[PDB]
Short mmCIF file of C-alpha atoms and ligand atoms in Angstrom, two decimals:
data_model
loop_
_atom_site.label_atom_id
_atom_site.label_comp_id
_atom_site.label_asym_id
_atom_site.label_seq_id
_atom_site.Cartn_x
_atom_site.Cartn_y
_atom_site.Cartn_z
CA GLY K 63 104.82 105.98 104.56
CA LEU K 64 107.99 104.10 103.73
CA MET K 65 109.69 107.23 105.10
CA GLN K 66 107.82 106.84 108.42
CA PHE K 67 109.10 103.25 108.79
CA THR K 68 111.39 102.38 111.71
CA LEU K 69 112.83 98.88 112.11
CA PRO K 70 112.11 97.06 115.39
CA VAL K 71 114.96 97.23 117.89
CA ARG K 72 115.12 93.46 118.40
CA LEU K 73 115.94 92.94 114.68
CA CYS K 74 118.98 95.33 114.47
CA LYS K 75 121.20 92.46 115.58
CA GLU K 76 119.46 89.59 113.79
CA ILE K 77 119.83 91.32 110.36
CA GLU K 78 123.60 91.19 110.79
CA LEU K 79 123.81 87.38 110.72
CA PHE K 80 124.61 85.87 107.34
CA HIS K 81 121.93 83.24 107.90
CA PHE K 82 119.12 85.75 108.60
CA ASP K 83 115.71 84.96 107.04
CA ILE K 84 113.61 87.88 105.82
CA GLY K 85 110.76 85.39 105.23
CA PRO K 86 108.43 86.27 108.10
CA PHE K 87 108.80 90.08 107.83
CA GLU K 88 106.98 90.75 104.53
CA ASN K 89 105.51 94.17 105.44
CA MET K 90 108.90 95.39 106.63
CA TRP K 91 110.97 94.20 103.61
CA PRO K 92 111.29 97.62 101.88
CA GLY K 93 112.10 99.32 105.15
CA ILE K 94 114.47 96.41 105.74
CA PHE K 95 116.27 97.45 102.54
CA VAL K 96 116.09 101.10 103.67
CA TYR K 97 117.63 100.11 106.99
CA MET K 98 120.46 98.25 105.24
CA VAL K 99 121.29 101.12 102.89
CA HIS K 100 121.44 103.54 105.81
CA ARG K 101 123.85 101.32 107.77
CA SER K 102 126.41 100.59 105.03
CA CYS K 103 126.00 103.79 103.01
CA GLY K 104 124.69 106.13 105.69
CA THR K 105 121.50 108.15 105.74
CA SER K 106 121.88 111.30 103.68
CA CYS K 107 123.57 109.12 101.06
CA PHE K 108 120.42 109.53 99.00
CA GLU K 109 117.62 112.02 99.25
CA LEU K 110 115.08 110.06 101.28
CA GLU K 111 112.03 110.91 99.12
CA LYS K 112 113.42 109.48 95.87
CA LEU K 113 114.93 106.43 97.59
CA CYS K 114 111.51 105.28 98.85
CA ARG K 115 110.02 105.95 95.40
CA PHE K 116 112.72 103.96 93.63
CA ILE K 117 112.12 101.07 96.04
CA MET K 118 108.35 100.50 95.90
CA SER K 119 108.38 100.90 92.12
CA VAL K 120 110.96 98.12 91.87
CA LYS K 121 108.56 96.05 93.98
CA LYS K 122 105.78 96.99 91.54
CA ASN K 123 108.00 95.77 88.71
CA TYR K 124 108.64 92.27 90.09
CA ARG K 125 106.10 89.72 88.90
CA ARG K 126 103.93 87.27 90.87
CA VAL K 127 106.18 84.35 89.88
CA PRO K 128 106.98 81.58 92.40
CA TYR K 129 110.72 82.19 92.99
CA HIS K 130 112.16 85.15 91.02
CA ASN K 131 109.75 87.55 92.83
CA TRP K 132 110.15 90.47 95.27
CA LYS K 133 111.07 88.13 98.16
CA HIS K 134 114.18 87.09 96.23
CA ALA K 135 115.42 90.60 95.43
CA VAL K 136 115.37 91.47 99.15
CA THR K 137 116.97 88.18 100.22
CA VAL K 138 119.83 88.79 97.83
CA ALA K 139 119.86 92.42 98.95
CA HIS K 140 120.39 91.16 102.49
CA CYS K 141 123.27 88.85 101.58
CA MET K 142 125.09 91.76 99.96
CA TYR K 143 124.59 93.86 103.09
CA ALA K 144 126.07 91.04 105.21
CA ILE K 145 129.16 90.67 102.99
CA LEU K 146 129.88 94.43 102.87
CA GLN K 147 129.41 94.78 106.63
CA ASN K 148 132.01 92.06 107.13
CA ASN K 149 134.41 93.60 104.53
CA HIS K 150 133.77 97.28 104.76
CA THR K 151 137.15 99.01 104.18
CA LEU K 152 137.57 96.93 101.00
CA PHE K 153 134.70 98.40 98.97
CA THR K 154 134.35 102.08 98.04
CA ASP K 155 131.19 104.09 98.56
CA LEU K 156 130.08 103.76 94.94
CA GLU K 157 130.48 100.00 95.17
CA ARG K 158 128.64 99.64 98.48
CA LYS K 159 125.66 101.63 97.16
CA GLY K 160 125.75 100.37 93.58
CA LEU K 161 125.84 96.77 94.76
CA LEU K 162 122.98 97.14 97.24
CA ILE K 163 120.95 98.69 94.40
CA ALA K 164 122.17 96.09 91.91
CA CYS K 165 121.05 93.21 94.09
CA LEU K 166 117.61 94.67 94.78
CA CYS K 167 117.15 95.07 91.01
CA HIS K 168 118.98 92.08 89.56
CA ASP K 169 115.88 90.09 88.45
CA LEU K 170 113.52 92.90 87.48
CA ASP K 171 110.40 91.64 85.64
CA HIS K 172 111.46 88.01 85.56
CA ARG K 173 108.77 85.91 83.89
CA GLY K 174 109.99 82.72 85.56
CA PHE K 175 111.42 81.33 82.29
CA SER K 176 115.04 80.33 81.73
CA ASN K 177 117.45 82.00 79.34
CA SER K 178 117.34 78.76 77.32
CA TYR K 179 113.54 78.71 77.10
CA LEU K 180 113.66 82.28 75.78
CA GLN K 181 116.50 81.39 73.43
CA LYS K 182 114.86 78.07 72.42
CA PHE K 183 111.50 79.58 71.38
CA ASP K 184 112.53 82.88 69.77
CA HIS K 185 111.22 85.16 72.49
CA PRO K 186 111.35 88.88 71.63
CA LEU K 187 113.75 89.24 74.55
CA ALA K 188 116.38 86.85 73.12
CA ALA K 189 116.06 88.84 69.89
CA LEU K 190 117.12 92.11 71.52
CA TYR K 191 119.37 90.28 74.02
CA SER K 192 121.05 87.32 72.31
CA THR K 193 123.34 86.08 75.12
CA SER K 194 122.72 86.58 78.86
CA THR K 195 119.17 87.39 77.85
CA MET K 196 117.26 88.10 81.06
CA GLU K 197 120.16 89.98 82.66
CA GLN K 198 120.46 92.43 79.77
CA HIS K 199 116.75 92.91 80.44
CA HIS K 200 117.02 93.26 84.25
CA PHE K 201 119.58 96.03 83.66
CA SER K 202 117.27 97.64 81.08
CA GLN K 203 114.44 97.55 83.61
CA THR K 204 116.69 99.03 86.30
CA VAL K 205 117.75 102.08 84.26
CA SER K 206 114.11 102.48 83.23
CA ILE K 207 112.96 103.03 86.80
CA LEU K 208 115.95 105.31 87.57
CA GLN K 209 115.10 107.66 84.68
CA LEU K 210 111.58 108.20 85.95
CA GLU K 211 110.99 111.61 87.50
CA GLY K 212 111.40 111.66 91.25
CA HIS K 213 113.36 108.42 90.90
CA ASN K 214 117.01 109.30 90.08
CA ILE K 215 118.75 108.74 93.42
CA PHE K 216 122.24 108.94 91.92
CA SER K 217 121.30 112.15 90.17
CA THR K 218 122.89 114.37 92.82
CA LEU K 219 126.47 113.18 92.20
CA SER K 220 129.01 113.71 89.44
CA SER K 221 128.26 112.32 86.00
CA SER K 222 131.66 110.61 86.11
CA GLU K 223 130.56 109.00 89.36
CA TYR K 224 127.11 108.49 87.80
CA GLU K 225 128.41 106.43 84.87
CA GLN K 226 130.64 104.42 87.21
CA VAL K 227 127.67 103.38 89.38
CA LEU K 228 125.90 102.56 86.13
CA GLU K 229 128.72 100.33 84.94
CA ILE K 230 129.21 98.69 88.35
CA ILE K 231 125.50 98.02 88.41
CA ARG K 232 125.41 96.58 84.87
CA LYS K 233 128.17 94.02 85.50
CA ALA K 234 126.76 92.76 88.79
CA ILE K 235 123.37 92.24 87.14
CA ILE K 236 124.92 90.36 84.18
CA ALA K 237 127.10 88.40 86.66
CA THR K 238 123.99 86.78 88.15
CA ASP K 239 123.91 84.80 84.82
CA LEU K 240 125.11 81.48 86.28
CA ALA K 241 126.51 80.40 82.90
CA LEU K 242 129.23 83.06 83.15
CA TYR K 243 129.81 82.28 86.82
CA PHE K 244 131.70 79.06 86.07
CA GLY K 245 134.44 80.82 84.08
CA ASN K 246 134.60 83.56 86.72
CA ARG K 247 135.09 81.19 89.70
CA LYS K 248 137.66 79.05 87.83
CA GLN K 249 139.56 82.17 86.73
CA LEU K 250 139.51 83.55 90.29
CA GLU K 251 140.97 80.24 91.50
CA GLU K 252 144.13 80.49 89.38
CA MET K 253 144.76 84.13 90.28
CA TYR K 254 144.59 82.97 93.89
CA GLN K 255 146.70 79.90 93.10
CA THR K 256 149.35 81.83 91.15
CA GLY K 257 149.34 84.74 93.63
CA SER K 258 148.30 87.04 90.76
CA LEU K 259 145.25 88.67 92.36
CA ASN K 260 145.35 92.44 92.77
CA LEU K 261 142.41 94.31 94.31
CA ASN K 262 144.02 97.43 92.81
CA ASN K 263 143.30 95.88 89.40
CA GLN K 264 139.89 97.21 88.36
CA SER K 265 139.32 94.13 86.18
CA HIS K 266 140.14 91.83 89.09
CA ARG K 267 137.68 93.63 91.38
CA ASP K 268 135.03 93.16 88.70
CA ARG K 269 135.45 89.37 88.90
CA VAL K 270 135.46 89.28 92.69
CA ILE K 271 132.21 91.27 92.71
CA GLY K 272 130.61 88.82 90.30
CA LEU K 273 131.50 85.98 92.63
CA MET K 274 129.81 87.92 95.44
CA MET K 275 126.74 88.36 93.27
CA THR K 276 126.51 84.62 92.61
CA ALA K 277 126.87 83.82 96.30
CA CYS K 278 124.16 86.39 97.08
CA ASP K 279 121.96 85.05 94.27
CA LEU K 280 122.32 81.46 95.55
CA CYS K 281 122.22 82.36 99.25
CA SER K 282 118.92 80.52 99.78
CA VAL K 283 121.20 77.51 100.32
CA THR K 284 122.90 79.31 103.22
CA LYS K 285 119.99 79.33 105.71
CA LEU K 286 118.96 77.19 108.65
CA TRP K 287 117.54 73.91 107.34
CA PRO K 288 113.83 74.80 107.75
CA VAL K 289 114.29 78.02 105.75
CA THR K 290 116.33 76.39 102.98
CA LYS K 291 113.90 73.48 102.59
CA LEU K 292 110.84 75.72 102.17
CA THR K 293 112.65 77.82 99.53
CA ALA K 294 113.34 74.73 97.44
CA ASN K 295 109.55 74.45 97.13
CA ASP K 296 109.50 77.90 95.59
CA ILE K 297 112.44 77.16 93.29
CA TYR K 298 111.00 74.04 91.70
CA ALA K 299 107.46 75.43 91.50
CA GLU K 300 108.92 77.83 88.90
CA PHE K 301 111.23 75.31 87.17
CA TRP K 302 108.23 72.96 87.08
CA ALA K 303 106.11 75.65 85.42
CA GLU K 304 108.75 76.01 82.67
CA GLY K 305 108.71 72.24 82.42
CA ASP K 306 104.93 72.16 82.06
CA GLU K 307 104.73 74.38 78.97
CA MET K 308 107.50 72.31 77.41
CA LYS K 309 105.28 69.26 77.89
CA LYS K 310 102.56 71.17 76.01
CA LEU K 311 105.06 71.79 73.21
CA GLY K 312 105.71 68.05 72.90
CA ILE K 313 109.20 68.12 74.50
CA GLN K 314 110.33 66.27 77.63
CA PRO K 315 111.86 68.87 79.99
CA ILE K 316 115.20 68.32 81.69
CA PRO K 317 114.89 66.48 85.02
CA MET K 318 115.43 69.65 87.08
CA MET K 319 112.24 70.98 85.49
CA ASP K 320 110.17 67.78 85.62
CA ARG K 321 107.50 67.69 88.31
CA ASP K 322 107.02 63.98 87.63
CA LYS K 323 110.60 63.29 88.80
CA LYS K 324 110.04 64.75 92.35
CA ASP K 325 111.78 61.78 93.95
CA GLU K 326 115.10 62.90 92.41
CA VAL K 327 114.97 66.44 93.85
CA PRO K 328 117.12 65.42 96.86
CA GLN K 329 119.63 63.79 94.52
CA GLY K 330 120.01 66.90 92.35
CA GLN K 331 120.15 69.11 95.42
CA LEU K 332 123.33 67.26 96.38
CA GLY K 333 124.67 67.44 92.82
CA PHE K 334 123.91 71.19 92.82
CA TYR K 335 125.70 71.85 96.11
CA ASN K 336 128.72 69.88 95.03
CA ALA K 337 128.90 71.23 91.45
CA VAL K 338 128.06 74.92 92.05
CA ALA K 339 127.33 75.85 95.65
CA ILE K 340 130.39 74.54 97.49
CA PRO K 341 132.77 75.74 94.71
CA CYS K 342 131.22 79.24 94.79
CA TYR K 343 131.34 79.87 98.56
CA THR K 344 134.75 78.09 98.77
CA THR K 345 136.45 80.55 96.41
CA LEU K 346 134.56 83.50 97.94
CA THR K 347 135.99 82.44 101.32
CA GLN K 348 139.56 82.12 100.08
CA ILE K 349 139.07 85.65 98.76
CA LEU K 350 136.97 87.24 101.55
CA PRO K 351 137.75 85.12 104.64
CA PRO K 352 135.25 87.01 106.86
CA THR K 353 132.52 85.36 104.72
CA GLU K 354 133.14 81.80 105.90
CA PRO K 355 129.68 81.43 107.51
CA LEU K 356 128.17 81.36 104.02
CA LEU K 357 130.42 78.35 103.42
CA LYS K 358 129.65 76.60 106.71
CA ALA K 359 125.84 76.82 106.32
CA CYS K 360 125.94 75.55 102.71
CA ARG K 361 127.84 72.53 104.06
CA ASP K 362 125.30 72.13 106.85
CA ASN K 363 122.46 72.02 104.31
CA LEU K 364 124.43 69.59 102.15
CA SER K 365 124.48 67.27 105.17
CA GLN K 366 120.69 67.57 105.43
CA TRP K 367 120.09 66.77 101.76
CA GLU K 368 122.46 63.88 102.34
CA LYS K 369 120.23 62.83 105.24
CA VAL K 370 117.08 63.07 103.04
CA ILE K 371 118.57 60.83 100.35
CA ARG K 372 119.73 58.18 102.82
CA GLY K 373 116.55 58.42 104.84
CA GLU K 374 118.95 58.86 107.83
C1 DZU N 459 115.93 66.10 89.79
C2 DZU N 459 116.96 67.20 89.61
C3 DZU N 459 118.03 67.04 88.73
C4 DZU N 459 118.97 68.05 88.53
C5 DZU N 459 118.83 69.21 89.26
C6 DZU N 459 117.79 69.41 90.15
C7 DZU N 459 116.84 68.39 90.31
N1 DZU N 459 117.93 70.61 90.85
C8 DZU N 459 119.05 71.11 90.38
C9 DZU N 459 119.52 72.45 90.68
C10 DZU N 459 118.75 73.38 91.23
C11 DZU N 459 119.08 74.80 91.34
C12 DZU N 459 119.39 75.53 90.21
C13 DZU N 459 119.75 76.87 90.29
C14 DZU N 459 119.82 77.50 91.49
C15 DZU N 459 119.51 76.81 92.69
C16 DZU N 459 119.57 77.39 93.97
C17 DZU N 459 119.25 76.65 95.06
C18 DZU N 459 118.87 75.33 94.89
N2 DZU N 459 118.80 74.72 93.72
C19 DZU N 459 119.13 75.45 92.61
N3 DZU N 459 119.68 70.31 89.44
C20 DZU N 459 121.05 70.20 89.06
C21 DZU N 459 122.04 70.14 90.02
C22 DZU N 459 123.37 70.14 89.65
C23 DZU N 459 123.74 70.27 88.32
C24 DZU N 459 122.75 70.43 87.37
O1 DZU N 459 123.43 70.78 86.22
C25 DZU N 459 122.70 71.06 85.02
C26 DZU N 459 123.51 72.07 84.23
C27 DZU N 459 123.21 73.52 84.61
N4 DZU N 459 124.40 74.37 84.82
C28 DZU N 459 124.96 74.85 83.55
C29 DZU N 459 123.96 75.73 82.83
N5 DZU N 459 123.59 76.89 83.65
C30 DZU N 459 122.62 77.73 82.95
C31 DZU N 459 123.05 76.43 84.93
C32 DZU N 459 124.05 75.53 85.65
C33 DZU N 459 121.40 70.34 87.71
MG1 MG N 460 118.50 86.24 86.95
ZN1 ZN N 461 118.42 86.13 91.13
#
């Protein structure tokens, strides 16, 4: 029945705004991803049957966590659509499709716990995956649903193209590890500064993609102020859960994860925009200037968080 889905006509335009909120369209979200794949990769880019199977199974394999759920895969999926539709002769076909898949899958089977939590308490996952722990998992989940029968959508294409869309997908998933993002954005800055970028350089494109993935991952902060505010509530409800179990293991969680410090959430929202969010969308704009609305909205929300703190 995901093949019988057709997107309402009035939405066709609204989806194309960077600021678009998928929030109120929960039933349509998988067809919303179908729509987006068929507009930037074309219908008949996959066999329909296996593309609807691969989608609902990925939904099945996202947990009922507060933030890193199905809603977030699709939201990031959207942001990637928006960036590729505003940059379309820059990215090949195997990037445009790999990256729409990568986004939809980038947090597969999140358990709402941070890399550090896993690493701090000897989780089985940080035993297999020692650094960038959840992302090595999210990419292991992704392959696992691809290799199910009736699920390999890249199967009908060359194995040299098939390993490329594997290795594009891997990187973008790992890139959503915000700890690596800092080095990536500072390295991109110099190459811009020194005029040493080269989009012919396959290792430079890899960085630029990773920037895009971080922007897409963080794009909750690029909505209209009512949308952004209500997503904060989801974000901390998960951080707070990871705080909670640290308070059962005797340890005082970091303020970000401390429900009992609620009055400082506005303060850290400003510190987060200024230390991560503005830097990210600033470099991504210097690099892809059609994606300046991501930058402008992030600034708009910064103003609002400013207005919360001041009580203005
Ligand atoms: C009371 C309080 C205090 C601090 C809070 C805080 C609340 N909320 C945040 C950040 C909310 C956040 C985190 C991640 C993704 C979002 C997307 C949208 C909105 N928010 C968020 N932070 C915050 C903001 C800025 C900096 C900060 O730095 C801590 C160091 C973390 N760095 C380095 C280590 N890597 C793993 C993560 C980034 C923490
Ligand atoms: Mg992640
Ligand atoms: Zn994510």
